[PDB]
Structure 1
Amino acid sequence: LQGKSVDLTDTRDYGSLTAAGLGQEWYGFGQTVFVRPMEQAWQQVLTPAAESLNARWRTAVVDGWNNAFSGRYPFKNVSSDASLPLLAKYLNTDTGRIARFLQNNLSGVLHREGSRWVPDTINTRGLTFNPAFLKAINTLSEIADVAFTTGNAGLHFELRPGTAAGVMQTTLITDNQKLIYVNQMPVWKRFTWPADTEAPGASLSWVSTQAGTRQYADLPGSWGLIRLLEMARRKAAPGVASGWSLSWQAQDGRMLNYTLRTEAGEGPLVLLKLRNFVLPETVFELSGTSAFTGNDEDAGDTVEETD
């Protein structure tokens, strides 16, 4: 499909010339002696080869992707978290293993285009694949072009001042980068999300009108900031360009608000797309011939942003 000069292509290139080299009366003859005994091999070569790439794909990269990231945090809600720099070998744009599977094993089928993966450059008929794979690679490349820009797997995002109602001393810590706030003039600040060596984690602590500090929740681990941000996703805001706010309804009705502004696309909210995300089954399956499910990638963000 992508190379040149095996015994299949040359016999059909031969079967064209002696066929169309006759008259206009033996055209219907030459079409059915010299070409048609190659299509009956071409229809019986590729569908075993279609379902062989399945059985190589669930030993090349799927078992590697479920052996390291099986029961850790951002795919199933357990305590311990998936390691950060090991994931950079599975989601890079040009050097990771998933990036080194779609450049030589099916290089005539999926061309890398922009940031997604365009399917209709096979120049081939009679071979379609599972739409689950095509969505589950697009989401992962959207993670690859927001968080991971230099391989070392770190983003940074602008910060949140507060405006509240009956509460003062809103404090949050993440990665030894403090934000103490006592109703001053609201001014942005800056968080880099994976920091240097520290006690890495995150927590939120406020001071009520009739009680001292009581921390909302402390969450340890380098994958800590994405855990406590999950809880209050009433987000969409008509203000700044990336335009996001957070609610964080803590105990006894005192709500402490924030307003998140990100830089490159969506910032660190896009890491919340990874929950309940399994790399799917087979590509190239016969089942699912006619299905139009091109609305989930809009409806999930519809439920996310409005609620």
Structure 2
Amino acid sequence: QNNLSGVLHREGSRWVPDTINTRGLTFNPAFLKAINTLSEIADVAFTTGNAGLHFELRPGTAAGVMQTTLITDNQKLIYVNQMPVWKRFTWPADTEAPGASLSWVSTQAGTRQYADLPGSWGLIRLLEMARRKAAPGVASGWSLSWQAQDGRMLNYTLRTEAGEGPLVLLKLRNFVLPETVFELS
């Protein structure tokens, strides 16, 4: 809004090239793909002016797993195969030890935890190591399923509230700002 005031419009959420005054002045077509991605994550995660969103998990069932425990940022979800409900999470909460951890209680052995990823970006590391696919049964859902050790699956069912929820931060994986706005050739 200081340097491209004529040739770039803030239409809706995306930035578009202004059609007037674009004689011989071409944008690098990665640069429009860049800051239409950095203005999508702005409209899912960073809506209120700071980092905060609300996504809902519903636990799932799996063959031969007695209890799965997902802890994010001191918010528990202990599932011992009862009637499943929706636990409305919050990322990133302002608690004392932000992290993410997943521990499953088999039928055979004791509780071997799947991963223990601390830090404020714990939860994005956990959704990166998932094996996610789109969910037909619920909208707008995403049926995650981490594969633990010993061939056991841990199934969860993520429902967002707008857009992609905290799956949208996995557009940032290997993201690079383009060095060139206008292309010259």
Give the structure-1-normalised TM-score: 0.58
Alpha-carbon contact 2:74-2:95 (below 8 Å) kept: no
* Higher RCO structure (Cα 8 Å, ≥6 apart): 2
Of the structure 1 ranges 131-140 and 155-164, higher mean CA displacement relative to structure 2 is found in 155-164
**Contact 1:154/1:192 (CA < 8 Å) preserved in 2?**
yes
Residue 270 of structure 1 and its aligned partner are, at CA, apart by: 0.4
Describe the superposition over 1:242-266 as per-residue Cα deviations: whole angstroms up to 9, x where unpaired. Answer: 1210110010111111111000111
Structure 1 runs not aligned, ≥5 long: 1-102, 287-306
RMSD: 3.0
Shift of 1:123: 2.9
* Partner Cα distance (1:108, 1:274) in 2: 29
Shift of 1:281: 1.5
Note if contact 1:111-1:121 (Cα within 8 Å) is conserved in structure 2. no
Q: Which whole-Å deviations, capped at 9, do the CAs of 1:46-79 have from their partners, x for residues lacking one?
A: xxxxxxxxxxxxxxxxxxxxxxxxxxxxxxxxxx
Kindly provide the CA deviation profile for residues 148-188 of structure 1, in whole angstroms up to 9, marking residues without a partner as x: 11112111111121211111111110011100011000111
Q: C-alpha displacement at 1:208, in angstroms?
A: 1.1
Runs of 4+ in 1 over 6 A off after TM superposition: none
Higher percent of residues as strand: 2
**C-alpha displacement at 1:104, in angstroms?**
1.7
Q: Distance in 2 between matches of 1:193 and 1:124?
A: 41
Indicate conservation of the 8 Å contact 1:108/1:121, yes or no. no
Q: Which has the higher helix share?
A: 1
* Paired residues of 1:156 and 1:192 also in contact (CA < 8 A): yes
Cα shift readout 1:99-147 (whole Å, capped 9, x = no counterpart): xxxx121101101100111103333311112101110000100000000
Tell me the SS of whatever aligns to 1:178: coil
**Counterparts of 1:121 and 1:238 in 2: how far apart (Å)?**
40
Match for 2:182 among 272, 284, 293? 284
CA distance in 1, matches of 2:48, 2:149: 40
Contact 2:74 2:98 in 1 (8 A): yes
DSSP 3-state at the match of 2:40: helix
Match of residue 254 from structure 1? 152
Identity of aligned residues (%): 99
In structure 2, how many angstroms separate the alpha carbons of the residues matched to 1:219 and 1:247?
17
Counterpart contact for 1:170–1:182, Cα < 8 Å: yes
Match of 2:77, SS state, is: strand
CA distance in 1, matches of 2:61, 2:75: 20
> Do the aligned partners of 2:56 and 2:159 also contact (CA within 8 Å) in 1?
yes
Q: Deviations over 1:3-51 (max 9, x none)?
A: xxxxxxxxxxxxxxxxxxxxxxxxxxxxxxxxxxxxxxxxxxxxxxxxx
User: Contact between 1:110 and 1:122, CA under 8 Å: does it hold in 2?
Assistant: no
Contact 2:132 2:142 in 1 (8 A): no
Q: CA deviation at 1:195?
A: 1.0
Contact 2:6 2:18 in 1 (8 A): no
What SS class does the counterpart of residue 52 from structure 2 fall into?
Answer: coil
Mapped contact 1:161–1:259 kept (Cα < 8 A): yes
Corresponding residue of 2:94: 196
Name the CA distance, whole Å, in 2 between partners of 1:203 and 1:272: 19
Distance 1:123 1:216 in 2: 56
Structure 2 counterpart SS, 1:159: strand
- TM normalised by structure 2 equals 0.95
